[PDB]
Amino acid sequence: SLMRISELYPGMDPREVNVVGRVLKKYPPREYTRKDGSVGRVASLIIYDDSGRARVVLWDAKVSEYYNKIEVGDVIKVLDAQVKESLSGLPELHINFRARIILNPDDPRVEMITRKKIKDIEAGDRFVEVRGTIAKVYRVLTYDACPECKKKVDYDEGLGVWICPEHGEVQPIKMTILDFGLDDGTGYIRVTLFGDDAEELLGVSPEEIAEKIKELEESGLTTKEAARKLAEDEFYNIIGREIVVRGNVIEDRFLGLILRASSWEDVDYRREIERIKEELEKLGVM
Amino acid sequence: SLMRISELYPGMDPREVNVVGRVLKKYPPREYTRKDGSVGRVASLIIYDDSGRARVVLWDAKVSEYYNKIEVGDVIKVLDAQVKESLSGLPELHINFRARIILNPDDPRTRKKIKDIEAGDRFVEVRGTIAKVYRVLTYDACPECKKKVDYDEGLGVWICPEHGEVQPIKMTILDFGLDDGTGYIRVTLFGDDAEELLGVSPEEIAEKIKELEESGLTTKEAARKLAEDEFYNIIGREIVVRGNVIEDRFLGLILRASSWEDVDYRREIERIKEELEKLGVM
Amino acid sequence: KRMPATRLYIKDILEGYFVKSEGDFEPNYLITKYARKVYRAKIVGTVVREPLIAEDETYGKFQVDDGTGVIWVLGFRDDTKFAKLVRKGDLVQVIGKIAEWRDDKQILVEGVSKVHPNMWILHRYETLKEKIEHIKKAKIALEIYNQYGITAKSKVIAKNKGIEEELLEVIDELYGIM
Amino acid sequence: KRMPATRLYIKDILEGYFVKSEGDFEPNYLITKYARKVYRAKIVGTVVREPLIAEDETYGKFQVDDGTGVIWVLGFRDDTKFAKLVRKGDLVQVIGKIAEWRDDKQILVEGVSKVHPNMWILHRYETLKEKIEHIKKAKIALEIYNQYGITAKSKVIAKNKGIEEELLEVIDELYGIM
Amino acid sequence: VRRRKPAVERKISEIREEDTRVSLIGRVIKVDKMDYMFWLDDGTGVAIIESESDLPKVGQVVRVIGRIIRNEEGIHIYAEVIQDFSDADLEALEEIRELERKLLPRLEGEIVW
Amino acid sequence: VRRRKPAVERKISEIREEDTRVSLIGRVIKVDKMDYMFWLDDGTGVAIIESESDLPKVGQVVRVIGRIIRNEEGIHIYAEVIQDFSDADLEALEEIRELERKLLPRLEGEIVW
DNA sequence: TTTTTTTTTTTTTTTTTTTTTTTTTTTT
Ligand SMILES: [Zn+2]
Ligand SMILES: [Zn+2]
């Protein structure tokens, strides 16, 4: 079969299931309770081919039959397995009575192991890719955040500790906030980057930003005033840079559409030129 | 003839008797009284060859004919003599009318099932499973008679009642039971045969017996303990034992095994095929 | 006295009728479907699983398969040593007392030792020979029992035909069980 | 609202018609020869001279050449910082408001940053694509204007042909200028 | 209660569909030390024996007790027990297998209570 | 009022007599570190580039903007700007130069007021 | 041919901070 892990989908015919993968992870076998009250065994592995990864779940006698025979780095071939949706929406291979596994198979596969213009953007838009120029820098600042939920933590002066409303006493991490604007030639949209993505774009450490914010606040400025000042005085160099942002669009009750960018990346010029060539062909140029 | 003195037996055919021997001893001629009341003569000599010694008894005219002609160191050839059992159970050569002597001759010189076994049985072959291990121990023995030797604290030497001051050898004793499917019998192996079955040296067994005795156990208690604790692995093994059956006044039939050997499976299968043919299978 | 260990197929032990002696000193025995009174068993098979030794060393056990059946072999206290001797895959000969636990017959190990593959062949030959010998004798004894029962006349007739008196009692006991 | 920065050739800015809004809050804009209303400009060129920073730091300026024209880029007061960023020879992308000083169009710097040579190529491709798109739309809008002018009927016809209502007003304003 | 099914003695050519655990006796002709598999020839056929840990030697006579695995690639035996049958009299074994085949059903059928 | 003439994009082989400031793109083949001159090859020819301060490396792809100097020794370019064009897709640049050559004159000529 | 002597038997098991969007004019 030429089938790849990327082609698996939940509820696909087990008779079509024929994939190979190298074992990346093996988890310990576990007990589980059956509907009849008895106790069975279940064990999970993670495998991958040239296309992607899949969880492989060995059930009951399949654990005794194969689990100790498999090791990390080995390749297995999986046949006739049921495909289920994992808790993260991804395909998993269930090795029940019907399924088979071939250890280190003889198989040829073994050796191989949305763009939207700003003018079209709407409120609540999800997974939008926008390529444009950084046009304005609103605010640059850092706040103490919980390392788990990334929410703002409060300093308790009575106990001398940092308190997260969700996780209690935590060790705070410095979270960077970058608010700017982006222009694509057909529209303008506000953009917000957080932590590691913002630090990567700014090219300055969050600890260094915190020190500069402190100097500004000591001079008689509030947190709001100091954040706007640092963006204009030190991070104005970022304006004019062409970037690709991906995120979801939320509508602020006065600020308008704000693009909460999950990631940013440098422009792939050949990809962009190909998009333009498509548009030129539509106009009757080529 | 190639016959040796060691091959003589009482009542053997005098026509087969043909031995040579050097004269070791000559006793004086004596008179003896005949059944008819007359008086005869009899004289005895001791001769030996490369195999053993024999008393030679010259009767009546054979004394006059040969006695003075023979001397110590001379070799004689004895023919056609009657062989009798001496008072010590050994063969003697009787030189009567029929016999001849040549002075300084020119001469170059059964499978039985345990259910069928009885007390006093001799040369019995029994194939069965080792079922129990009674005792494993070693004792100091005489290298000649293999009997238990006594240590004398006054002289610091080992004394054998039969051979005197001797160098003791360690003798292994293995007492176990054997089962053949039709019966059960006690078995005893000695020395080299027992060591071969146990797969442990007698010196090593003596050391283990010493450790057990030091702990507060007697020789009897230590022998039973070592058999159960270390030699229990021998149980379940199929073997062939050969020996004589003696009846103990309370322990019952004990098979004193002269030898033991591994089972010849093809020989045993052939015996079973014979039994199957008798049942109308083949 | 010490009665014999009977060479049998595991199937014959498993299908038998265990008899618990009410006396604290009387030996337990089994009566096979072919009216064979068995006090001790002698079997030859393969150890199919790695032995089971209880952590507290109170018991040790191992499984033996001979082709006709599968039986457990148990050693208690220091007798756990017997189970430690064997390993998964060993071809062994076992002698012991027949026991019944949870209505399943088993063997209380008296001895276990590794055997040559030709011993397994010898065992099969002996087992079949003894089985035929016993069945033919029990068939004649059953006819005597159905005609006369357990009487002084039937005991004389049984001796004349090479049948032991005990065999008629085993038939009567088996009829009482069934 | 915040209208878009239009990607154009420097020549198109230079040849345009600057429109000064009379209101103190209204944004100034430019109308190109192809009837394109431009509030902000987005250009990609090379800095041809070392920047000019006034000694008193009141203004900072730098020159950009794109092959089709040469334009000055100005930053005032603290915005002088933009001119300090660049150096002679840098290949940069500039966004800003179009201004006219001494009847010469220029760019009031909003942002300037160094770009990869492939960005200059991407800029040329986008500039040409947008130009063709605009010209074809303006040609149809000009025919509508010559036939009907700025009427309720012409606005409906313009929407049907994918033309914005604002485009007809730009044509009328351009005719008034010329 | 899934009691352990005794290994059914078979020849490679006589393996049945309903058989789940078998006992085969043959000679090793090929050993794959990477996929842990070996080729067993008994005279009646060749079976592919998948082993977990014990790999025999080429030319060794062995007895295998294993579970039968039926897949799209064929029928292979997942070996549970592999014993050295190098000194075993297979002629005698064959003779006793025939004796059991003939006499065992007759002995059971003689019971007329 | 001598306003700065924009750099005219040319190939070395297409340089015209009337050209005073040009933009050339090529690979450096030789650098004279004493006379501050370097040899630029674009595929269509080789031009001698006289530099004031910036000297590129041999084998480096560079874009040069310079004034043309016409003397008895030949035509050399007095380099004003030298940019690193090492990662530049010259295939794409060549394609856009041809698109501009074809379409720009047609777009200007479409104006019928 | 040997040491030393009391035979055998039952029963026991496990996703974030904090919130008011954009805009003109100034140039040696
Ligand atoms: Zn938290
Ligand atoms: Zn002695």
Numbering used by the authors:
A (entry chain A): 62 to 174, 186 to 358
B (entry chain D): 62 to 170, 186 to 358
C (entry chain H), D (entry chain B): 3 to 180
E (entry chain I), F (entry chain C): 5 to 117
Quote the original article.
In Archaea, the same function is also fulfilled by a heterotrimeric RPA. We report three crystal structures and five cryo-EM structures of Pyrococcus abyssi RPA (hereafter referred to PabRPA), in its apo form as well as bound to ssDNA. We find that archaeal and eukaryotic RPAs share a conserved heterotrimerization core, which is composed of three OB domains connected through a three-helix bundle formed by a C-terminal α-helix from each subunit.
In the first dataset, PabRPA protomers adopt a relaxed linear configuration that resembles the one observed for yeast RPA (SceRPA), a study that was conducted using the same poly-dT100 substrate. 2D class averages show additional density for OB-1 that connects two Tri-Cs from adjacent RPAs. Both 3D reconstructions show that two PabRPA molecules interact with each other on ssDNA through the OB-1 domain of one PabRPA that packs against the Tri-C of an adjacent PabRPA protomer particularly with its OB-4 domain. While their OB-1 domains are similarly oriented in both types of oligomeric forms, the OB-1 domain is more loosely packed to the adjacent Tri-C in the relaxed form than in the condensed one. Differences between the two DNA-bound PabRPA oligomeric forms are due to a rotation around the OB-1/OB-2 domains of the Rpa1 subunit. Importantly, in both types of filaments, the DNA-binding groove of OB-1 is ideally located to route the ssDNA from an RPA to the other, and protect the DNA from nucleases.
